[PDB]
Symmetry: D3
Subunit: 241 residues, 6 copies
């Protein structure tokens, strides 16, 4: 039939169709790959706007995975709905990033403790002041401990979520490196304050695809291996959450 | 084969695969509907991240149509690439919007002359000052004249592009209405300054899906009819551009 | 007698003494020149603070012309009063400007679609966000069509209204040129949002007196000819409004 | 002859035609009244844009008086030129103001020690920080001592220079009163930093025309008497400067 | 002798007189209490401005303790010097705080993951953007694990470092509670970015003295017991760092 | 006994223990030196946090002296309490400063008319606008006249109160010098608006310890002599207040 129930303007899943724990990545096609290779009992629960989402189990524990699109405004829509309408308790963003830090390398796995931003969305939430987009400590710890159990080294520290992929901003990379921001992406800084609003949990893990300073770049095969390592860390972390 | 050439990180189209004129809408599935119903000579030229794009002709004139995702950061990626890598000259954003204006109604067609925003991306381009995201006059005029020839009434005026769909901002709707902003969406304010940077052209036309104040809402069938009217205006406008 | 009725602190005209359409220029002595050479049935209706204003007819249609002084705060006083107390419907600012754009030349006529600014007055109107000072489309179109009928070429695009004539701001000219701002003046960005507040119309047309980058400068005779061309465009446009 | 030498775009006076000490008021017609009633040896030195200026002597000492128009951008043009081109050393702004302070009354004379503002012009001068627009102490003291010698009571304290005469700003009056701002005007905050830039001196004295809270208002005759008291204080102060 | 060597304007300690790990609290008299009750091998190494500092050992491991005064500017001076001149590697701020969170109680121990602020110091470090003042994960984890081993419950989450103890800011407490800020203090947000600049580590642990909403307040004896619990957690954590 | 009455969280003095006039300096040990050498009838009235305060008489007139610590947040606590709880009428800050002005020299005495800042505390008080931290004119005049009677030359003008002693800010010194800021310190800009809030008086006098540009620096003996000159000016000024 040409029409289905819509719980939100952006998601056709019914309440109850999402697990309490959700992995989100920017690319919905990567969400499908995760579901098709790591979940059992899996069903597709959303395809509105092509933003594929799936619910199943990982090692028997309910888990959903869904795309979030690119940028703070896009993840904010999807995450707000997940926490509010779908009653999700924990979201882990899984993704890729650039780096400027001189001691972070392509293929490294970065576990995000907090994320800076050039967006205004968090100033709007705290009377114009500085509101740190901060990962939940239990989520950070679950990711760190899972990586340790898997013998996968990790970088742990700050990300920077920009609204502008194609930066023209003189001095930005130098400041990010001086203060040891390890990951440049476009979303985490929008996710963490929404989790706070709902009394819920969020974190982020990313693999470095490109070094913005040295120009080093992971090949497609290296990116696949990096994502496999990262996704295994995230999946194992969900068992602790 | 498991790998194709990538002209950008987000688009597998080769240079030359996009026409000089492009319609963009947020929903890639709507881009497909536009291509499948209004273009001839059509081919799919991108599917990276599910962000479908197509190139063909409308009444014999080359025209592309592609999704842009939700929010300023997402459209900025895709539009920057279209102007820079693909040498596009004109982008018309086609979409839906809310309204707060007391004399704008659900199903109305809004032609955007400029768009306000709560994003920082334009302050970053003009030394922290106010940079109006302004549609190109030839594009605005082409849309206005096409609607006149089709006997479709239009509202012509300002939009507001927000980073936050799920607004919690007291007083925003009252200020938007007081100054007669006619459309609330999430993208135009990011598109117009990129067109300026490249010495190129952009505009936006949107149909009102929801009245944010009165709670009126277009049914699915009404939204389809509204989109048909709007897309015909946009398509006819491309013949003048 | 040493005292006359004052409808506002800045204007001795009685309500009804201003036509529904008004041209405003910064120099009150230029307002007098316009009245003395282009209006019939003309009377001086204000001289408070030397800010001369006149009401008569252009080709039989009621039209006023008045000075506005230099800068956003000055035009804001006079325009607020015109719309609020005097019930004016349409104001066209007529003036001179500088340019930094590499393809705009001294003596060019610029029709303003929107104006940026370094003033805070528009942030104050929209909860601290970006509020584009946007000309009314009917006014822009009337100016464009009048110039076409007169065979006078025009540049159509963005202005920048600064609070600081004597700029010391490194990088400003480069950013303005990069984004193709065509006119540098001091007032339009304050006028357009006031028109919006009152549900009324405004626009601006300016002639380039000086190229800020190349140092080219119109002679007094060239400025007179430029103003004659511009004023004829504006006057003819009022017949359409 | 239809053309005269222009030392600046806004002033036809030749260098040397302005005294080292200048009184400026917003209304050029008031500048004429001051010249015609208090100066000897007087000549009109500017009439561009109707912004009348005069040079003569007060009690034998060279003194100029000129209008400055309304608002920070207007006074900034004229004062920048006076200090830079005309080599002026001291400017005293003489004007009218409103008040919100519960212990300041209509007809009071206010001597300004510093002026707040809603303009961005001073942030632009100090890397975005707070730059207090501060009167020169010798000027303040000369005004205070002159008023004492004339037995004229004065209020001494902060002004607030707004870009928006027609305020719509909730809470502004309450904050201004809480911190004992004594005068509301539109110019001093732009004058004092320009004097600083040139290593020169500035101050301001104003008479209260209106109480913004109680709605009390000076009659025309009361405003004349107030201005007479204020101008005598300013004139006597110039003899000390 | 009336004069001693000064390695910095604020500290008479010689380089080498501070251990690589330092506890800092606002009250220098509390620093003395910590040294006199928990350190062996202890000596006073600074008394400039009364800002007492001490170096000794805790369970044999070198450890310093010093006051930092109240507010971001004060801690910034002392911490900058400790990392830069004294080559410190790890600073743990130990202190007291208020809370607004409905589920945080007087006497609770809060381990800070990141701290918001109303200061501009971090915007100045990151081109005007949002720079989250973020604790080092190893420090956070050491505090969490030490509290667990001591069977002391802890709250783990965000602090807010204000410049204004005596807040008059309507809506601040409501926003802080909505986003589950657990601790209100005046310093952590200045410490963490300095540690980042030096490639070093910092964290913060605080005990709740007052509930800002309910008005509950710890008695002097309760504050002593709370501080004893907190200091034992911090001291044990230093053995892991 | 291990516990005393606390009128505030930071001051054990009882109401009435502070005189209506107070000198404050950053270093509490310097407050003690002032009390021990210039006051009679003196008693120590506070030692909480080591922030020594004393009350006695100078030439028979009640006078207190107390430390304020370093930075705007610290002085704000102590001064707010002094005006609010202790009913103080006049505070003179006495301190040291740097200078960048080319005509200000080490050992000079600077009397502050107003102070700029990089803090947000004054924007928070005036709806986000520019609120000049302005000394009371009677206090400034008392300091100026006292220095004259003592034959001590003074510089009179603007200070700049920074949150960051260890500046890394390119261009700051050049802007401060261009606009003739004479003193760089960390506190005055926080004191003056608090005095305004309470309808009370404040000022500041400082001696130049270091020239930030030329690197000149006062020796310890020169700083002692400078402080003696400055404190005598301040003490004599209190007799006029
Ligand atoms: O260098 C980078 N900058 C910004 N985002 C990045 C970068 N590298 C990876 N991403 C991630 O991939 C998308 C953009 O291609 C964004 O969604 C972001 O999450
Ligand atoms: O009320 C509205 N606010 C913001 N965006 C809207 C609204 N109505 C339609 N859109 C449009 O649809 C997407 C969000 O659903 C956004 O991409 C925007 O373009
Ligand atoms: O380059 C320019 N900058 C700013 N304003 C200008 C410029 N050229 C012309 N005007 C116009 O003339 C007055 C100032 O002389 C301003 O009122 C503005 O409208
Ligand atoms: O209440 C007032 N607000 C703002 N400016 C005022 C006020 N009263 C007097 N002026 C003064 O008069 C002009 C405006 O009429 C401005 O130039 C200002 O200097
Ligand atoms: O509610 C509170 N607000 C701000 N700082 C606080 C609060 N409670 C404790 N502190 C802490 O104690 C000092 C101020 O008394 C500050 O140094 C801060 O660290
Ligand atoms: O150059 C300077 N910058 C900032 N503060 C200074 C300077 N010189 C003196 N002080 C003063 O001394 C303390 C810092 O050492 C601050 O409290 C300030 O009042
Ligand atoms: Cl992805
Ligand atoms: Cl589905
Ligand atoms: Cl990049
Ligand atoms: Cl769409
Ligand atoms: Cl494809
Ligand atoms: Cl909404
Ligand atoms: Cl003009
Ligand atoms: Cl008249
Ligand atoms: Cl210029
Ligand atoms: Cl006047
Ligand atoms: Cl003349
Ligand atoms: Cl008003
Ligand atoms: Cl403490
Ligand atoms: Cl010592
Ligand atoms: Cl509080
Ligand atoms: Cl001191
Ligand atoms: Cl005591
Ligand atoms: Cl410094």
């Amino acid at each position: 039939h040409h029409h289905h129930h819509m719980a939100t303007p952006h998601n056709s899943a019914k309440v109850g169709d999402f697990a309490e724990t959700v992995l989100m990545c920017g690319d919905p096609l990567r969400a499908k790959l995760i579901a098709d290779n790591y979940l059992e009992n899996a069903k597709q629960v959303n395809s509105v706007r092509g933003m594929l989402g799936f619910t199943g189990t990982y090692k028997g524990k309910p888990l959903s995975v869904m795309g979030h699109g690119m940028g703070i405004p896009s993840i904010s829509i999807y995450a707000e709905e997940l926490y509010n309408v779908y009653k999700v308790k924990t979201i882990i963003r899984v993704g890729t990033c650039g780096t400027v830090d001189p001691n972070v390398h392509v293929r490294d796995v970065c576990i995000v403790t907090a994320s800076g931003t050039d967006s205004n969305v968090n100033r709007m939430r705290l009377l114009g002041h500085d509101f740190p987009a901060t990962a939940n400590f239990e989520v950070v710890s679950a990711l760190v401990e899972s990586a340790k159990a898997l013998n996968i080294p990790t970088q742990v520290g700050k990300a920077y979520s920009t609204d502008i992929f194609y930066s023209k901003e003189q001095g930005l990379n130098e400041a990010l490196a001086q203060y040891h921001f390890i990951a440049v992406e476009m979303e985490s800084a929008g996710l963490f304050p929404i989790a706070d609003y709902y009394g819920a949990r969020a974190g982020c893990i990313c693999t470095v695809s490109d070094h913005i300073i040295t120009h080093e770049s992971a090949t497609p095969e290296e990116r696949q291996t990096s994502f496999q390592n990262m996704i295994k860390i995230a999946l194992e972390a969900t068992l602790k959450l």
